[PDB]
Design a protein around this ligand. Structure first.
Ligand SMILES: [Zn+2]
Ligand SMILES: [Zn+2]
Ligand SMILES: [Zn+2]
Ligand SMILES: [Zn+2]
Ligand SMILES: [Zn+2]
Lengths: 368, 264, 506, 182, 104
């Protein structure tokens, strides 16, 4: 490949914390950045600091009342803000902190600029881990997400590409993104997620899309604790079929750390290389890529995961030994660069997976 | 004061009163008041307003008599009700405790919601009946697929449908997880009870008390157009006793007609 | 043929209630209500288990938009909400009619989370405290740098500094002092620097505490089945468990002789189990002094007779059948369990040892400052000392009682990367095996059947009545209720087959 | 006092309660079949076949009083908490034009149907006589029967997902949140 | 309706008493099936001759002590349905009216 990889990072993303016990900390972005920098990778990517987005750009997908409420709400002014809090689901699940507007603007600006750079051809690989809030849908904060900048990325890519493909690998289904393109045939959303009594709850197998988006939405229902050898086996053939058949011009991938082995909320049994297998397979097709970072609440794991992936995209394999980052204490007893899977029993039987393959491929048989 | 709305009987935003210790939701109020523009003053319930402005222990008869005589020439059957409903606090609408009892298949939820008959490591014991000592032979796979404790990676999960208790593999019918929190799972060996045909909608009648159930049996026994309300062996919910062989007959000539529509 | 399909379906379904539902479905189709595709699917779910009757139905009947289940559809009234940036193409590609709102998809019940062990929770607590310390320190450092760039300018990203000032001036005087700065910079900057120094000191002490706490917990947290093991095994390695397994296999096979099957490729595992069993037998103060040697002799004879591996090298360290009762069968299953455990352990032993001996260390600060010297001080870090043999040695140690199970299991985790969790009950499984042999000797009927097996095995050349008379004699020594287990072994390939002839001998 | 509601009307009322409370659906307003116009059709169709003047004038009085009572009580005893939000929205939309509220011209055939279900519970807490209650009950029964003949046209099965003109409409998450949170 | 362990409602004079079934009698085999069951008539168990040859059942009255277990046949043991509940309430109301007439 030897792709020209651009990169985006704002130094203000590690200075906005959620609630004390809240599992969502963007500090993981910052030690992931330090993992990237101390490995000497800074000589291989084009580092940028994208401009934060403005209200006129969030109103492209979100609503004027929603954005206006976002720009004015504050922990100090909360007590008089009662109707909007319940109306837009901005209460406890998605709490309000000091720099919420700033963080949302940073994430949206970074992802929207990444899509812009992919459009102009400055890079064929744009990476923005700050974005990836695949749960909020145009009017409400959901799943700790407040702004679905991903849809802005696909909007900008569609400005140049006739077809854009979205892949979700977060153990959470890409509800907001699939909803944003449930009816259009330009975008395919393909979410690999856990299906059951899980927080998304959506992503049913028979969710091929409505309207013109019929047969243009793929949902992969999975059981607990899938491992690398099974995740790759369920991943690769479907991606092969979609690329061979839907044939997107652009493609967007959501790289969430939630499916990591031993995630604070995750339940999957993916190690480092099982996760990197999907990235390698995606980069194996040549079409431009816009990598974001979604789930993951074990920052010592997601930082290592993201550093390994950014090494992999530049077609290099990083060292297994740490370069003595600043936050050295975070990286366990051995201080290596890997995620060790646990001994739990994987319940994803081959027969259920085979039926899933049969259904998905039969549905795709009509997407030349 | 109260932790429930005096109309919805639910917690939440409360516009409580001072004359009468009552608690109301802002929406559960007539007219619905916007909490943004607070009245900012003494708010009394409709009953409090009537008890203060009108309720002179004897003069109330004078008021009701006056209202009646301003409506006796006009509609007067409703005059008493029209007068009296002005003395009452708004309340959430509920069914009158007997329409529900007309159907012995419905129950009221916690706050008053609808509820019906479908509301609801290595575990090898899940394959055991435990009352007959037998295994759970799934209908689709005709096995239990217990695997072994030594090799747990061969066992197959079973849900044992919540209606007719038929055991089923998670792999025999595609399913990711068990049904534990939501509705009761039902295996696909049950009637649809609802049909969309091209559109047109069909629904099966509800469960009524057998006191009011009027069972009926036809006489032609070959051709008798009935709904899905059949029995295999106010006069509107009659359930046909179908005489099972009539089902076979009706199916047969129906297939014959489906043949001759395209054959001639 | 076509006039008997109803009876065929009745016999196939085999139930009255399901037949009632199928008849109701057939009526519903017959009353024009149900269409053909729904009827076809219902018959596939009723008679689709067969490739003959269902196909007959398909070709006799001549069968030859679709909304999703997780999305609602709002009316057009809820479409018009002005979006100040939505372009026409955005109006084209977006979707505002169909929304899921997972609460609607969740049946308003809730979501089931995942189970996490207490070690994971402690890791979460440590991670949270670390994140708070580092976030405070980074915010203070950023504001310190900004104040330095301000003060160096005045000598002659909009909320971080206000937030940190309010946190530092938590007396609610931060509000006034922020505006006072906006119009006193050095004093607040130096106070921030002092707070940074104290925070970094406390962070270093807490980092020490956190590392010390984590170093013992981390390996335990990833041990998911291991923590549950040694306890689930006790109720899961009972005779009733194996009877249930074999009966389920036989029941499944009876809907369509070799119900069970085992293979024994390795040989030294037999000697390893012999060594461990003798270590336990000598160590245990629970048998008579001659009983220890009697158990050892029974074990050695049974191994050298059934497998005929060696009658003497055991002390230096034609298909044969066998009718057995529950006791002998369960003892055999015990032996099989131990053999498979040790086979799994030894199969990857080479790569396990290879990785262990290749375990390098980071020298940036790990070897400089902090090292894990707990499993190394006792010698359970497998330096050299091939994993299989050190495992055998420490198993003999734990049987002999000079090693607590805590460090046994911690070492097994840290060496096999939690891949040898099923070895945590080796002492107890060996004890159960010894008890099973002891029961085998002390039963008269079991002794007679055991001698009958000895005769059948050592004969090795029998007549055409071999199975019949042997089975009849075993049954005569037996009652008329408890099951038979047909354990066969061919010396050609070291394969053992078990047949569950419960009561078929009658 | 005993009221004999037909079984089909009872089923319709149960379905309405289930749709409003369980499925969260609200009525599609303003109805193409409203309370005022159904009452007008009832009065017209019954009066043309009734020749007695006293019962014909009493029919008109009954219809007028029914309209008045329905208008007076929709906003008080005939709405679930969920529909209170849409009720307030209609109230404010009408107040934006300084216009009054005519529920008989908005609601139809189903809030009128739910109106006559607590009538035994409403008359019981009054000082009105017995034979007048009997007359009112008889009038309600006759109206119920007349509705029963014209029943294949006021409650028809259409899905909101398959039909925009369906009697019910799917609600939005924000609407449900504001309605059922306060 | 009528099964081992199932609920039942049996007549007793001008009122009914609900009970739970424990034994099911088979007059053809002169045998009853009980639950903690092919077994002959018990040494201390017997049924009145007017219900020894009928489908009798051993029932325990709820709200009554365990000493009031009775063998009641199909004559009084009714089928527990909505009609059974409505008719139990009807005769309870008639008992109330009889009590009120005895009083007022
Ligand atoms: Zn996630
Ligand atoms: Zn209320
Ligand atoms: Zn009041
Ligand atoms: Zn099955
Ligand atoms: Zn079923």
């Amino acid at each position: 490949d030897k792709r020209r990889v651009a990169y985006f990072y704002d130094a203000d993303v590690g200075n906005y914390a959620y609630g004390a016990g809240h599992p969502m900390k963007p500090h993981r972005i910052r030690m992931a950045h330090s993992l990237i920098m101390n490995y000497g990778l800074y000589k291989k990517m084009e580092i940028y600091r994208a401009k934060p987005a403005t209200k006129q750009e969030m109103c492209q997908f979100h609503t004027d009342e929603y954005i206006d409420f976002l720009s004015r709400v504050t922990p100090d002014n909360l007590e008089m803000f009662k109707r909007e809090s319940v109306k837009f689901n901005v209460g406890d699940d998605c709490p309000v902190f000091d720099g919420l507007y700033e963080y949302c603007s940073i994430s949206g600006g970074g992802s929207m600029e990444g899509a812009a750079r992919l459009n102009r051809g400055k890079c064929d690989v744009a990476v923005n881990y700050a974005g990836g809030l695949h749960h909020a849908k145009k009017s409400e904060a959901s799943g700790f997400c407040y702004l679905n900048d991903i849809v802005l990325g696909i909007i900008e890519l569609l400005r140049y590409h006739p077809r854009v493909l979205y892949i979700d690998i977060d153990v959470h289904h890409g509800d907001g993104v699939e909803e944003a393109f449930y009816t259009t045939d330009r975008v395919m959303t393909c979410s690999f997620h856990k299906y059951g009594e899980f927080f998304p709850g959506t992503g049913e197998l028979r969710d091929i899309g409505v309207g013109a988006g019929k047969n243009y939405a793929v949902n992969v229902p999975l059981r607990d604790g899938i491992d690398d050898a099974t995740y790759r086996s369920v991943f690769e053939p479907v991606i092969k079929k979609i690329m061979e058949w839907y044939q997107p011009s652009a493609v967007v991938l959501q790289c969430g750390g939630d499916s990591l082995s031993g995630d604070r909320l995750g339940c999957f049994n993916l190690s480092m290389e099982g996760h990197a297998n999907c990235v390698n397979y995606v980069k194996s097709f040549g079409i431009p890529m816009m990598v974001v970072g979604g789930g993951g609440y074990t920052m010592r794991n997601v930082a290592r995961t993201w550093c390994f992936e950014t090494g992999l995209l530049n077609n290099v394999v990083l060292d297994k030994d740490l370069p003595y980052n600043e936050y050295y204490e975070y990286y366990g007893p051995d201080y290596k660069l890997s995620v060790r899977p646990s001994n739990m029993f994987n319940v994803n039987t081959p027969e259920y997976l085979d039926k899933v393959m049969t259904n998905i491929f039969a549905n795709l048989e009509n997407t030349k | 004061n109260e932790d429930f709305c005096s109309a919805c009987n639910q917690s939440g935003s409360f516009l409580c009163c001072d004359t009468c210790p009552k608690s109301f939701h802002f929406l559960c109020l007539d007219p619905p008041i916007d909490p943004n523009n607070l009245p900012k003053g003494d708010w009394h319930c409709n009953e409090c307003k009537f008890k203060i402005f009108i309720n002179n222990s004897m003069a109330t008869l004078k008021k009701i008599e006056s209202n009646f005589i301003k409506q006796n020439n006009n509609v007067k059957i409703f005059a008493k009700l029209l007068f009296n409903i002005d003395s009452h606090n708004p309340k959430q609408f509920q069914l009158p405790n007997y329409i529900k009892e007309t159907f012995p298949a419905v129950k009221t939820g916690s706050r008053g919601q609808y509820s019906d008959e479908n509301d609801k490591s290595y575990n090898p014991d899940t394959h055991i009946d435990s009352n007959s000592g037998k295994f759970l032979i799934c209908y689709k796979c005709n096995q239990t697929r217990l695997g072994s404790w030594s090799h747990p990676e061969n066992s197959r999960l079973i849900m044992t449908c919540d209606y007719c208790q038929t055991p089923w593999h998670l792999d025999c019918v595609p399913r990711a997880s068990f049904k534990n929190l939501g509705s009761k799972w039902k295996c696909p060996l049950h009637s649809p009870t609802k049909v969309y045909k091209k559109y047109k909608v069909w629904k099966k009648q509800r469960l009524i008390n057998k006191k009011n159930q009027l069972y009926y049996e036809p006489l032609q026994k070959i051709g008798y157009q009935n709904n899905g309300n059949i029995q295999i062996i106010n006069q509107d919910f009659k359930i046909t006793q179908i005489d099972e062989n009539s089902i076979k007959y009706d199916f047969f000539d129906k297939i014959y007609k489906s043949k001759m529509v395209q054959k001639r | 043929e076509e006039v008997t399909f109803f009876e065929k379906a009745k016999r196939y379904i085999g139930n009255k209630h399901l037949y009632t539902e199928f008849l109701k479905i057939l009526n519903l189709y017959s009353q024009d209500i149900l269409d053909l595709d729904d009827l076809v699917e219902k018959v596939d779910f009723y008679l689709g288990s067969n490739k003959e009757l269902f196909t007959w139905f398909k070709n006799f009947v001549g069968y030859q938009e679709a909304f999703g289940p997780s999305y609602k559809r709002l009316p057009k009234s809820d479409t018009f909400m002005p979006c100040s940036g939505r372009d026409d193409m955005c109006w084209e590609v977006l979707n505002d009619e169909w929304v899921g709102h997972p609460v609607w998809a969740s049946e308003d019940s809730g979501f089931i989370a995942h189970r996490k062990n207490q070690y994971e929770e402690t890791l979460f607590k440590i991670e949270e405290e670390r994140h708070e310390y580092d976030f405070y320190i980074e915010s203070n450092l950023r504001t310190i740098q900004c104040l330095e760039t301000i003060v160096n300018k005045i000598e002659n990203s909009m909320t971080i500094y206000k937030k940190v000032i309010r946190k530092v001036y938590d007396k609610e005087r931060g509000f006034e002092i922020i505006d006072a700065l906006h119009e006193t910079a050095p004093v607040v900057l130096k106070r921030l620097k002092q707070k940074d120094e104290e925070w970094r000191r406390a962070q270093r002490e807490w980092n020490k505490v956190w590392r010390e706490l984590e170093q013992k917990v981390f390996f335990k947290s990833l041990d998911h089945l291991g923590l549950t093991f040694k306890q689930a095994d006790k109720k899961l390695l009972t005779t009733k468990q194996l009877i249930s397994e074999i009966s389920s296999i036989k029941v499944d096979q009876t809907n369509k002789k070799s119900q069970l099957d085992f293979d024994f490729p390795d040989k030294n595992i037999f000697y390893d189990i012999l060594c461990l069993a003798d270590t336990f037998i000598t160590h245990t103060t629970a048998y008579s002094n001659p009983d220890k040697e009697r158990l050892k002799d029974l074990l050695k004879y049974f191994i050298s007779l059934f497998f005929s591996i060696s009658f003497e090298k055991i002390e230096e360290s034609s298909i044969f059948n066998l009718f057995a009762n529950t006791n002998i069968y369960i003892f055999f299953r015990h032996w099989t369990t131990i053999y498979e455990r040790l086979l799994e352990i030894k199969q990857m032993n080479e790569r396990v040892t290879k990785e262990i001996n290749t375990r390098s260390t980071v020298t940036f600060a790990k070897d400089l400052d902090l090292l894990s010297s707990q499993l190394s001080e006792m010698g359970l870090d497998f330096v050299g000392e091939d994993a299989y043999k050190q495992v055998l040695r420490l198993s003999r140690r734990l049987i002999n009682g000079d090693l607590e199970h805590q460090w046994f299991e911690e070492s097994l985790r840290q060496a096999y990367n939690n891949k040898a969790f099923k070895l945590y009950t080796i002492d107890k499984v060996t004890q159960s095996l010894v008890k099973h042999a002891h029961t085998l000797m002390t039963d008269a009927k079991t002794a007679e059947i055991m001698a009958l097996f000895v005769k059948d095995r050592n004969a090795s050349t029998t007549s055409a009545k071999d199975q019949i008379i042997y089975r009849l004699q075993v049954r005569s020594h037996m009652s008329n209720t408890e099951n038979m287990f047909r354990i066969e072994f061919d010396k050609r390939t070291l394969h053992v087959s078990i047949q569950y002839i419960a009561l078929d001998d009658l | 006092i005993s009221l004999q509601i037909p079984i089909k009307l009872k089923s319709v009322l149960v379905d309405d309660w289930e749709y409003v409370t369980k499925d969260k659906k609200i009525c599609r307003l303003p109805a193409d079949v409203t309370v005022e116009m159904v009452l007008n059709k009832y009065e017209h169709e019954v009066s043309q076949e009734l020749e007695s003047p006293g019962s014909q004038s009493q029919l008109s009085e009954y219809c007028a009083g029914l309209k008045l009572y329905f208008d007076k009580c929709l906003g008080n005893m005939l709405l679930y908490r969920l529909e209170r939000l849409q009720y307030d929205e209609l109230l404010k939309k009408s107040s934006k034009d300084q216009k009054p509220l005519v529920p008989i011209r908005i609601y139809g055939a189903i809030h009128l149907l739910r109106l006559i279900s607590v009538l035994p519970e409403l008359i019981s807490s009054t000082t009105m006589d017995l034979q007048s209650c009997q007359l009112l009950i008889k009038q309600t029964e006759d109206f119920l029967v007349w509705l029963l003949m014209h029943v294949d046209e006021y409650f028809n099965d259409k899905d909101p997902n398959r039909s925009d003109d369906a009697l019910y409409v799917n609600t939005s998450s924000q609407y449900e949140g504001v309605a059922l949170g306060m | 309706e009528f099964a081992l362990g199932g609920r039942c409602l049996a007549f007793h004079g001008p009122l009914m008493y609900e009970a739970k079934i424990l034994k099911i009698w088979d007059p053809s085999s002169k045998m009853y099936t009980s639950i903690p069951k092919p077994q002959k008539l018990g040494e201390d168990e017997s049924i009145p001759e007017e219900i020894i040859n009928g489908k009798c059942f051993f029932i325990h009255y709820q709200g009554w002590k365990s000493s009031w277990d009775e063998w009641v046949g199909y004559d009084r043991i009714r089928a527990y349905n909505e009609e059974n509940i409505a008719m139990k309430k009807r005769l309870a109301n008639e008992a109330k009216e009889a009590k009120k007439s005895l009083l007022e």
